[PDB]
Amino acid sequence: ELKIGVPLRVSYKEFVSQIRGTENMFKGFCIDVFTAAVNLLPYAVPVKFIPYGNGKENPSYTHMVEMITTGNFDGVVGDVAIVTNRTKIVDFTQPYAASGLVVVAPGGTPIKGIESLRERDDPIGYQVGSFAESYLRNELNISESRLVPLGTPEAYAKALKDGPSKGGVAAIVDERPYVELFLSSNCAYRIVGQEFTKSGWGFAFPRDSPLAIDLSTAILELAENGDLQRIHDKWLMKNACT
Ligand code: NA
Numbered sequence: 520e521l522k523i524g525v526p527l528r529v530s531y532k533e534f535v536s537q538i539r540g541t542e543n544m545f546k547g548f549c550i551d552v553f554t555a556a557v558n559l560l561p562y563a564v565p566v567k568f569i570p571y572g573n574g575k576e577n578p579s580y581t582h583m584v585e586m587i588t589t590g591n592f593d594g595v596v597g598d599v600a601i602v603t604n605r606t607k608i609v610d611f612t613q614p615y616a617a618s619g620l621v622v623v624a625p626g627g628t629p630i631k632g633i634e635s636l637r638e639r640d641d642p643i644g645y646q647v648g649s650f651a652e653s654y655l656r657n658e659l660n661i662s663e664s665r666l667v668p669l670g671t672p673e674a675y676a677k678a679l680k681d682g683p684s685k686g687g688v689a690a691i692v693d694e695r696p697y698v699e700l701f702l703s704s705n706c707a708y709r710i711v712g713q714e715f716t717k718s719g720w721g722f723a724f725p726r727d728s729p730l731a732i733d734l735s736t737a738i739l740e741l742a743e744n745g746d747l748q749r750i751h752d753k754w755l756m757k758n759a760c761t
Pocket residue numbers: 748751
């Protein structure tokens with residue numbers, strides 16, 4: 520029986536959430552893809568889902584994956600970006616979902632994309648517990664003092680409305696999937712510029728886990744037979760702004 524860490528999300532629960540009144544029961548896009556993939560394997564994979572987080576805010580996804588290395592988890596299943604600092608310590612499947620950082624801002628500001636954001640000294644929103652915090656500091660050398668953690672689409676919307684003057688932000692940097700959910704309920708804001716990273720979401724296992732290999736060929740079967748699209752459309756189909 521594999522102990523599988525699952526992030527205890529407080530927001531964008533379409534991706535994955537703990538079913539209310541349970542410890543070990545989860546639902547969402549990521550759970551459905553995991554389940555569909557495992558069922559395509561020719562051996563049984565018994566699983567216990569173990570919640571990772573205090574349940575008050577989204578957990579550190581990097582610290583979550585780090586629990587595989589200490590042996591606390593046999594695997595992590597969730598909306599987990601396949602980024603270098605994680606791939607060096609655990610083995611991911613190939614991505615089951617496309618992701619990548621975008622800039623979200625109000626229309627017709629000085630923010631035209633990630634480069635404009637770097638040239639300026641405005642405060643930047645990112646999602647609590649995201650790798651995005653680390654990409655901004657280390658890869659793009661953005662100052663720690665500019666970075667504002669936001670937990671939910673309500674907080675996103677408040678931060679963008681208040682703006683830099685009133686303790687909010689000029690823009691938020693976050694993965695496209697959360698930004699698409701955010702905008703479908705908050706059409707006053709837009710993506711400006713393009714995706715400037717392209718790391719997908721994958722299932723995480725210990726270094727040399729054959730599960731990482733096998734599930735990648737399950738993901739190909741899910742892609743071809745159209746179940747990936749079907750499971751996307753079940754959870755994430757939303758009313759667009761344009
Ligand atoms: Na799609």
